[PDB]
Write a protein that holds these residues in place. Structure first.
Motif, PDB file in Angstrom:
ATOM      1  N   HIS A 144     -18.769   1.267   8.138  1.00 42.50           N
ATOM      2  CA  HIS A 144     -17.878   2.439   8.260  1.00 42.50           C
ATOM      3  C   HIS A 144     -16.981   2.516   7.016  1.00 42.50           C
ATOM      4  O   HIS A 144     -16.544   1.484   6.502  1.00 42.50           O
ATOM      5  N   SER A 145     -16.670   3.741   6.574  1.00 37.91           N
ATOM      6  CA  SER A 145     -15.863   3.973   5.361  1.00 37.91           C
ATOM      7  C   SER A 145     -14.413   3.440   5.490  1.00 37.91           C
ATOM      8  O   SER A 145     -13.744   3.228   4.465  1.00 37.91           O
ATOM      9  N   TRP A 146     -13.927   3.229   6.741  1.00 36.23           N
ATOM     10  CA  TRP A 146     -12.563   2.714   6.979  1.00 36.23           C
ATOM     11  C   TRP A 146     -12.458   1.198   6.743  1.00 36.23           C
ATOM     12  O   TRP A 146     -11.454   0.742   6.198  1.00 36.23           O
ATOM     13  N   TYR A 147     -13.486   0.421   7.118  1.00 34.86           N
ATOM     14  CA  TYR A 147     -13.450  -1.051   6.951  1.00 34.86           C
ATOM     15  C   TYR A 147     -14.285  -1.436   5.733  1.00 34.86           C
ATOM     16  O   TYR A 147     -15.348  -0.861   5.506  1.00 34.86           O
ATOM     17  N   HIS A 148     -13.793  -2.384   4.926  1.00 30.52           N
ATOM     18  CA  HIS A 148     -14.495  -2.838   3.704  1.00 30.52           C
ATOM     19  C   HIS A 148     -14.609  -4.375   3.658  1.00 30.52           C
ATOM     20  O   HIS A 148     -14.813  -4.948   2.587  1.00 30.52           O
TER      21      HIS A 148
END
Length: 255
Positions: A144-148
């Motif tokens: 997901h683009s929110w968690y890296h």
């Protein structure tokens, strides 16, 4: 003893191995009996499971300057399953303390060591400590683009410097299990705050709030007043631009 102030771990295929200082002896057991298809193109069905944190025993170690940026080899997720990893490199078990993994093998990571020494994993090959340099998450929240995932302050603030007002990143520490951080950019100003992890593995940023999942941490903090200078509006993107969307129009219902 155990002196190594020299700059180990360089930007290369087959990176170096840290020293075995901390040996668990046994570790945990019974994570989940599931794998997945080895198709390079596939999307998710439901949320990717990271509930009450299994990774505990935190040490905020002074991270120096690991100046390098290779690409995040994120293959893809599973249906509704716990954060599945994959070995990017081969690693033969040097003893009972370590786990034999091979490139392309889907790994189940129970947690990391406090010193960021090794990562306690479990596979068809058995269970043991594997080097974080030889592995990457795929069915993690990181897709997901929110968690890296586990990143440096440099890598985090780099991706966030591409963001704008109300931009965020949710991430964890590389050398510390359970220590996680969110990074906001607002008015062009970059400021970071710590996710505190309680004894059981529950996550919280504020004293007014408690979260059993990081998904509910981000959701709550995406909508709330709770000690946020800005609510989590939109995340700072991945180097390669992805295409995800969604609306789902609100049809009200009282009783």
């Amino acid at each position: 003893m155990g002196q190594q102030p020299g700059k180990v771990l360089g930007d290369q295929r087959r990176p170096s191995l840290p020293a075995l200082h901390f040996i668990k002896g046994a570790g945990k057991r019974e994570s989940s009996r599931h794998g997945g298809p080895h198709c390079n193109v596939f999307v998710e069905h439901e949320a990717l499971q990271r509930p009450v944190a299994s990774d505990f025993e935190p040490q905020g170690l002074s991270e120096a300057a690991r100046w390098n940026s290779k690409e995040n080899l994120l293959a893809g997720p599973s249906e509704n399953d716990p954060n599945l990893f994959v070995a990017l490199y081969d690693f033969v078990a040097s003893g009972d303390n370590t786990l034999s993994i091979t490139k392309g093998e889907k790994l189940r990571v129970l947690g990391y060591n406090h010193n960021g020494e090794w990562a306690e994993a479990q596979t068809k090959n058995g269970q043991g400590w594997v080097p974080s340099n030889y592995i990457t998450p795929v069915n993690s929240l990181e897709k997901h683009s929110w968690y890296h995932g586990p990143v440096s302050r440099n890598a985090a603030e780099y991706l966030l410097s591409s963001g704008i007002n109300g931009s965020f990143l949710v991430r964890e520490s590389e050398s510390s299990p359970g220590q996680r951080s969110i990074s906001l950019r607002y008015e062009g100003r970059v400021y970071h705050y710590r996710i505190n992890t309680a004894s059981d593995g529950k996550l919280y940023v504020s004293s007014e709030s408690r979260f059993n999942t990081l998904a509910e941490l981000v959701h709550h903090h995406s909508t709330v007043a709770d000690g946020l200078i800005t609510t989590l509006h939109y995340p700072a993107p991945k180097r390669n631009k992805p295409t995800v969307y969604g609306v789902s129009p609100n049809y009200d219902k009282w009783e």
